Design a protein around this nucleic acid. Structure first.
Ligand SMILES: Nc1ncnc2c1ncn2[C@@H]1O[C@H](COP(=O)(O)OP(=O)(O)OP(O)(O)=S)[C@@H](O)[C@H]1O
Ligand SMILES: Nc1ncnc2c1ncn2[C@@H]1O[C@H](COP(=O)(O)OP(=O)(O)OP(O)(O)=S)[C@@H](O)[C@H]1O
Ligand SMILES: Nc1ncnc2c1ncn2[C@@H]1O[C@H](COP(=O)(O)OP(=O)(O)OP(O)(O)=S)[C@@H](O)[C@H]1O
Ligand SMILES: [Mg+2]
Ligand SMILES: [Mg+2]
Ligand SMILES: [Mg+2]
Lengths: 292, 162, 266, 317, 405
DNA sequence: GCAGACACTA
């Protein structure tokens, strides 16, 4: 076997996979195996990209026997995996050991589950014909518009409050002041009218927040950054922020936004896409209501 | 690897110089892309004349390494229902480009096999989301296309190769 | 207007606004210097639900009717301001989040309703629903407090209401009989082409005239158990004059909230 | 990043719009007075209907265009409940407008919208006629139900004539400072056949691919419209000439047989200088050929046989 | 400003554009309803769009309610309408409010229309004391191209499945389009109301032909009022476009058979009929109508050769799998041959719907009878004979054999 | 477009 991994605590794996089910449940996940660990990436409509990474120390029997360039790809349907795993991993403290296997290329993804003298073995055939490779919605750190670190619980509560309101179009605000009264909020408009959820300047949920001038070194005060993001991406990310410790916000002048989720724990990084243009001249009325 | 493929796919053109016969169309589209102006090209002709090959070569020429995340290719093999079309193309066109300062090209192979409502939604998106997003229409049959689509899209005819 | 409350009255406020939204999609909210008035007139002109919030409900009542410039249609002479907003818009705003609490809530109007929510932590949520300033149609309230004596316990009545399978949407028949109130909830069977049962008759009754609605009655009684009333909080009342033609009158007295209800019978 | 000539020169005022002079003038008086009634605009696609509606709304509102319009298009969640709720919420708000001005709601491509949504629209207009107004944009008025057309004013749009399209072409040429020729402009008009957007696209292709606008360049970049060739070959007297015309045009330029059959059916339906019996016989033969092609027999021999039968019934031996 | 059709809303009963016979009929029906002995539980008033349906009930309820608000219009879902109907059930005494069902809820879905039907059946058969009056207004207008009833023609017969209509406690009064004389009188009333603005522009001297064209072109009073308002507001030299109406199912057959008086040439008439009414002329059970109605051109007194050619051409059209070209060819051939033979035409016969549903019902009855016969024969002993041979041998011989034994 | 019967004042 080229890749092998074993784990005893499947609660972490299943709660990490539950954060991918709102949109990634359909198909077309590109798992990566390397010396760093195990990673899953999902990208639909080329509008949002999610990366969930599993470290070496998470697995107990990581071997990774290879004699190549050390980068092998495989694409498997998520829905088959979810349907297979739904029946197992039942009850609590079932000490279900999961064994991962992949014989390089042309072999199905093999999962072995053992639960109280009862073993299971599911083979997941992959799809590697039209794999265009490369891909990735990456951004350069030399021109980051602003950086923000927020608590996971506050963001989860904000998103779960925003979801049921509606708000098919959402906005992201960034603002810094000289008196350390930093302003950060995710406002939106809906049929209800105007919805404003505000994250205060308290360091409990706004530990770090600075607005840059496109050089990632020159921090400035009194400058406003407007981010027009669709409701779909925020709805998809709401589940991913349900269980977390710290959430990192970072977008550049290009408008693409990278959100890092910390939960040692695993790291989840998601890349977003901004809308082409703001609706007419709305951004003006966003600030005009913000200092109102 | 190569040398193990059918000659139809083995000899697929990769550059605009590799497309023979339609010299006028190739020169016109080269002049269009040299000025950074893509006026919603529409390609019509008999099968085997090199429509999708020409658009693939053009996308390779004008983008290069941006084909993986800027070109949205839709065809008959993918579901093109009214809701699916409106959602997918609205999400693709409404989003701003990542880093490249160029128009976004969407290729629609076999556009004749879509419903009338889907074609109406597509022709509304063409005129609405056009600041950064362009459209390409490929179809061997024009009777199944809405006449409004043929008006907003510049029609190019692919003659049989001499 | 600026009315702020910091107590556990958010539950009863949300229950009342949900009742008003279920009765009518659009809720006409009229604010006066005396107290706070909220109501929603039925489409069938058979339901009049009145809820009153006294000045003791909030901690401040800084209302300035004379300073209102925009929306003079709803400003008429005790000067008061009237406006209407969608019930579903506000019910999803006044909801209590799961796993969290709200320590401060207030509602205000600008010169676009200015309503904000302040949870236990520092995070706050602000909403701007659209209202419409209407013509202080308080003649319904004039008929309501225009003005027998029946009193009974409310918790067993609420149990009867919520275990009677309101899904079939039957009618309620207040059978006073001689002395004991026997609450009944059944539907009337309908004949078919030849004595056929097009609609099944699900009848249930128990023993502890006039026929009125069932969801109105349930919504009116849900206000009681929602708020913990250690002091006062007496049971509901039922008032109705002779003949079934006139509507009925109900009142539920609370130290800070006044409940009224008018339901047209037959 | 240069916008195409179709979208770079979109008119912003009703004065720049050409075509139906009387209708444009009427729209100008409506904008000036402010009395905006419910309207339905139908006609040939790409003649300036949605553009005219947008220009009228802009001239009527000014600074109120930020909130005073709810442009619901075909490419949207055009259902029965969410659309009704959105229109109701739009109609249940008031803004600071003059008494002679009213809110305008634009529904482009109302033909494809579901009939239940049409009934919901009728309910919204009946309930909130005093505050907001509705402006429809479509190609034909047949798809709009009769009760909705009853509560509006219908303004049919005719095809743009030679003068208006030529004038617009001259203004755009002067704006772009491009050398042109009268013969080239005539060829552009002939290929457009009354279409404005198609004429602009053809002119843009001519100037990009060759520069100077000449008839030869226009004919090279784009061929003549197929209905004209179909009409030319159908009324040909001798069978040999019609056969040669159809071959050398359609098969050499690469036209699909089913498209040829459909165009011939449309031409025969719109034909004028033919008897009723001859027209119906030709329609029957067109239907037979269409069935043969749809089943799978769509070779040149079928088209040649169809022309032979048409000429046989024309000559009657 | 305010719309003319809303600003000039009628106040008295004489202002409503309603026929004297229609007004008397609706008055008598309502008066019968308001008595304690209710002959009709519900009132159904179908008709084309904008033929003054709702206003008749509005001013009638205005003038009759104080004798013994005005109406309770239901806003345009399922449980909401159920609650509305239940609340209307409890409005009988001291109010006497009429229940109006104008702008009925969504019926394009099967479930909502079915539940509407059971609600109507339940309220029609309710044996409860007294009765609140109820009026249902339905607009007859076919749904354009976007089955089995809906999406082909939206009318009273589409929504109600031949059970509510065939009820003793119902009075179906179909409404006709507004009369030309009444339309002219109402347009003249609007003009004499707007004398000042009429004299402001040069439109008073060119009024009679415009009024006549508007009255004779469309039968909708609201559309006529809107067209008059648009023409008066316009400076001039602007052609007027009206509300293009629809052609009924039998009207299409009449136009195909006899022709059109407005357009003598057949080609333009056929093209207009195909363009405006493609759905009606392309949908099934319409060629059957022509095949059953072509005999009434001269009460069956024309040449046999023309009829033979007609049916042969119809067979060729049916051979083309219902293509639009086939329909066009068949209609053109029928129109051409009737125009040719119309040199001697008088006393045309009446038209009827083709007897297609009765044949299907009889076929279903034959099928269920054959199934029962197979079941009883298989219960008695072993006998299988498929289905093809039954109609030829066992459909007649076995009944008489069983009867004799 | 067709017929059969009624409206309405000259
Ligand atoms: N101008 C050309 N010169 C040389 N080879 C060509 C040319 N055009 C097409 N081909 C060949 O034709 C093959 C298939 O052509 P495609 O462009 O993929 O299909 P198509 O011509 O677009 O027809 P369809 O039915 O619309 S997919 C290519 O792989 C080439 O080998
Ligand atoms: N009269 C005109 N004068 C100048 N440009 C015009 C005129 N009519 C159309 N155009 C151009 O054509 C473009 C398309 O016009 P539209 O109004 O979008 O077409 P349409 O009449 O709405 O029909 P559709 O969109 O196919 S349903 C406009 O943006 C203009 O650039
Ligand atoms: N003299 C008149 N007689 C009748 N209606 C009039 C008259 N003058 C104006 N109207 C208006 O014409 C309309 C006629 O109303 P109705 O036809 O009864 O409504 P409706 O039946 O719902 O019409 P549809 O079929 O839904 S479009 C109303 O809006 C009236 O205000
Ligand atoms: Mg192709
Ligand atoms: Mg348009
Ligand atoms: Mg009405």
């Amino acid at each position: 076997n080229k890749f092998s991994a074993s784990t005893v605590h499947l609660e972490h794996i299943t709660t990490a996979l539950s954060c991918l089910t709102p949109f990634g449940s359909k198909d077309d996940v590109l798992i990566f195996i390397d010396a760093d660990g195990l990673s899953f990436v999902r990208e639909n409509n080329h509008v949002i990209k999610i990366q969930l990474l599993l470290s070496r120390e998470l697995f107990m029997s990581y071997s990774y026997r290879n004699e190549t360039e050390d980068h092998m790809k495989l694409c498997v349907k998520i829905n088959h995996i979810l349907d297979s795993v739904s029946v197992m991993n039942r009850n609590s403290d079932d000490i279900v050991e999961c064994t991962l296997s992949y014989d390089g290329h042309g072999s199905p993804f093999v999962l072995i589950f053992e639960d109280s003298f009862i073993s299971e073995r599911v083979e997941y055939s992959t799809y590697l014909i039209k794999d265009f490779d490369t891909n990735g919605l990456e951004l350069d750190r030399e021109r980051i518009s602003f950086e923000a670190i927020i608590k996971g619980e506050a963001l989860h509560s904000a998103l779960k409050d925003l979801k049921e309101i509606g708000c098919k179009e959402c906005y992201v605000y960034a603002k810094t002041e000289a008196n350390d009264e930093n302003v950060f909020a995710l406002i939106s408009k809906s049929q209800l009218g105007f919805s404003k959820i505000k994250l205060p300047s308290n360091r409990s949920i706004l530990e770090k927040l600075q607005v840059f001038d496109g050089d990632s070194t020159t921090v400035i005060d009194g400058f406003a950054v407007i981010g027009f993001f669709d409701f779909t991406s925020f709805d998809k990310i709401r589940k991913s922020t349900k269980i977390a410790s710290k959430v990192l916000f970072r977008m550049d002048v290009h408008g693409v936004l990278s959100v890092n989720i910390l939960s040692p724990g695993i790291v989840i990084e998601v890349c977003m896409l901004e809308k082409e243009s703001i609706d007419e001249a709305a951004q003006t009325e966003i600030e005009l209501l913000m200092e109102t | 690897s190569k040398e193990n493929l059918p000659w139809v796919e083995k000899y697929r053109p990769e550059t605009l110089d590799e497309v023979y016969g339609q010299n006028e169309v190739i020169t016109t589209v080269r002049k269009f892309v040299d000025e950074g102006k893509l006026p919603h090209l529409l390609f019509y002709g008999p099968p085997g004349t090199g429509k999708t090959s020409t658009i693939v070569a053009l996308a390779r020429e004008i983008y290069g390494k941006n084909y993986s995340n800027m070109v949205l290719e839709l065809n008959a093999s993918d579901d093109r229902g009214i809701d699916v079309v409106r959602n997918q193309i609205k999400d693709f066109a409404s989003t701003r480009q990542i880093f490249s300062k160029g128009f976004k090209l969407i290729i629609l192979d076999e556009a004749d096999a879509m419903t009338n409502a889907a074609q109406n939604a597509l022709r509304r998106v063409i005129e609405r989301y056009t600041k950064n997003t362009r459209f390409c229409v490929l179809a061997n049959y024009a009777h199944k296309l809405t006449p409004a689509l043929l008006s907003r899209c510049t029609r190019f005819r692919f003659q049989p190769l001499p | 207007k600026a009315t702020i409350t910091e107590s556990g009255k958010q539950n009863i406020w949300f229950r009342a606004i949900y009742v008003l939204s279920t009765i009518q999609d659009d809720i006409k909210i009229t604010v006066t210097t005396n107290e706070l008035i909220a109501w929603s007139m039925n489409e069938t002109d058979t339901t009049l639900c009145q809820v009153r919030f006294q000045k003791s409900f909030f901690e401040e009542y800084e209302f300035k009717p004379h300073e209102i410039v925009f929306g003079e249609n709803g400003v008429q002479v005790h000067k008061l301001y009237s406006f209407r907003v969608n019930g579903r818009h506000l019910t999803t705003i006044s909801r209590k989040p799961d796993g969290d609490g709200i320590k401060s809530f207030t509602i205000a109007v600008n010169n676009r309703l200015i309503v904000v929510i302040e949870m236990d932590s520092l995070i706050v949520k602000e909403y701007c629903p659209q209202f419409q300033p209407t013509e202080r149609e308080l003649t319904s309230a004039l008929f309501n407090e225009e003005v027998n004596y029946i009193c009974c316990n409310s918790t067993l009545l609420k149990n009867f209401l919520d275990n009677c399978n309101v899904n079939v949407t039957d009618e309620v028949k207040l059978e006073i009989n001689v002395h004991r109130l026997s609450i009944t909830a059944f539907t009337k069977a309908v004949y078919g082409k030849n004595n056929d049962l097009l609609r099944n008759a699900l009848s249930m009754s128990n023993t502890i005239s006039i026929i009125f609605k069932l969801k109105d009655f349930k919504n009116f009684i849900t206000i009681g158990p929602s708020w913990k009333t250690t002091q006062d909080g007496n049971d509901n009342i039922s008032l109705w004059f002779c003949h079934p033609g006139d509507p009925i009158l109900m009142q539920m007295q609370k130290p800070g909230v006044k409940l009224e209800l008018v339901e047209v019978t037959d | 990043l240069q916008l195409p000539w179709v979208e770079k020169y979109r008119p912003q005022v009703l004065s720049d719009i050409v075509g139906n002079k009387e209708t444009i003038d009427r729209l100008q008086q409506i904008a000036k007075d402010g009395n905006m009634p419910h309207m339905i605009i139908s006609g040939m696609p790409g003649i300036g209907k949605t553009t005219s509606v947008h220009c009228l709304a802009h001239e009527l509102l000014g600074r109120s265009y930020a909130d005073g319009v709810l442009e619901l298009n075909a490419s949207d969640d055009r259902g029965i409940d969410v659309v009704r709720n959105q229109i109701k919420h739009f109609a249940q708000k008031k803004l600071h407008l003059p008494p002679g001005k009213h809110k305008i709601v634009i529904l482009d491509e109302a033909d494809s919208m579901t009939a239940g949504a049409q009934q919901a629209l009728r309910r919204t207009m009946e309930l909130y006629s005093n505050s907001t107004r509705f402006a429809f944009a479509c190609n034909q008025s047949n798809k709009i139900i009769e009760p909705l057309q009853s509560r509006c004013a219908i303004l049919r749009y005719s095809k743009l004539s030679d003068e208006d399209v030529l004038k617009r072409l001259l203004q755009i040429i002067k704006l772009e400072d491009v050398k042109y020729t009268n013969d080239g402009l005539e060829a552009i008009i002939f290929t457009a056949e009354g279409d404005m957007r198609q004429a602009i696209n053809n002119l843009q292709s001519t100037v990009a691919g060759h520069g100077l606008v000449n008839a030869d360049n226009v004919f090279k970049i784009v061929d003549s419209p197929h209905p004209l060739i179909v009409k030319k070959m159908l009324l040909a007297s001798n069978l040999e000439d019609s056969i040669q015309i159809l071959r050398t045009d359609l098969w050499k330029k690469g036209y699909s047989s089913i498209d040829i059959v459909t165009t011939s059916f449309r031409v025969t339906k719109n034909l004028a200088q033919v008897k009723e019996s001859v027209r119906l016989e030709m329609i029957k033969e067109i239907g037979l050929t269409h069935m043969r092609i749809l089943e799978g027999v769509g070779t040149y021999l079928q088209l040649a046989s169809m022309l032979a039968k048409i000429h046989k019934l024309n000559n009657k031996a | 400003g305010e719309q003319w059709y809303e600003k000039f809303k009628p106040n008295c009963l004489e202002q409503v554009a309603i026929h004297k016979r229609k007004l008397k009929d609706v008055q008598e029906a309502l008066d019968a309803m308001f008595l304690p002995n209710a002959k009709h539980r519900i009132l159904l008033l179908s008709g084309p769009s904008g033929c003054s349906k709702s206003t008749v009930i509005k001013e009638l309820s205005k003038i009759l309610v104080p004798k013994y608000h005005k109406v309770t219009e239901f806003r345009g879902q399922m449980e909401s309408f159920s609650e509305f109907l239940k609340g209307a059930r409890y409005l009988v005494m001291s109010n006497l409010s009429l229940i109006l069902i104008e702008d009925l809820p969504n019926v394009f879905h099967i479930d909502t229309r079915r539940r509407f039907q059971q609600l109507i059946l339940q309220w029609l058969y309710s044996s409860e004391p007294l009765l609140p009056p109820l009026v249902i207004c339905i607009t007859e207008c076919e749904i354009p191209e976007n089955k089995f009833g809906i999406d082909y023609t939206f009318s009273a017969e589409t929504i109600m499945n031949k059970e509510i209509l065939m009820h003793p406690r119902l009075k179906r009064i179909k409404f006709n389009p507004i009369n030309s004389t009444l339309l002219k009188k109402h347009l003249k009333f609007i003009c004499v109301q707007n004398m000042k603005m009429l004299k402001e522009k040069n439109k008073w001297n060119k009024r009679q032909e415009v009024i006549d064209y508007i009255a004779q072109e469309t039968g909708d009073i609201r559309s006529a009022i809107t067209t008059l308002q648009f023409w008066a507001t316009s400076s001039g030299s602007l052609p007027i476009s009206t509300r293009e109406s629809t052609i009924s199912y039998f009207h299409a057959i009449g136009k195909v058979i006899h022709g059109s008086h407005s357009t003598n040439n057949d080609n333009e008439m056929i093209n207009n009929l195909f363009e405006n009414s493609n759905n009606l002329l392309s949908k099934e059970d319409f060629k059957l109508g022509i095949l059953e109605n072509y005999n009434t051109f001269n009460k069956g007194e024309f040449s046999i050769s023309d009829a033979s050619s007609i049916v042969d051409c119809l067979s060729e059209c049916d051979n083309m799998n219902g293509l639009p070209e086939s329909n066009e060819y068949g209609l053109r051939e029928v129109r051409k041959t009737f125009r040719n033979i119309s040199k001697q035409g008088h006393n045309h016969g009446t038209v009827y719907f083709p007897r297609e549903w009765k044949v299907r019902k009889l076929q279903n009855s034959f099928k269920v009878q054959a199934e029962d016969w197979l079941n009883v024969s298989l219960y008695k002993y072993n006998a299988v004979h498929s289905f093809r041979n039954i109609t030829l041998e066992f459909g007649y011989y076995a009944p008489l054999i069983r009867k004799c034994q």
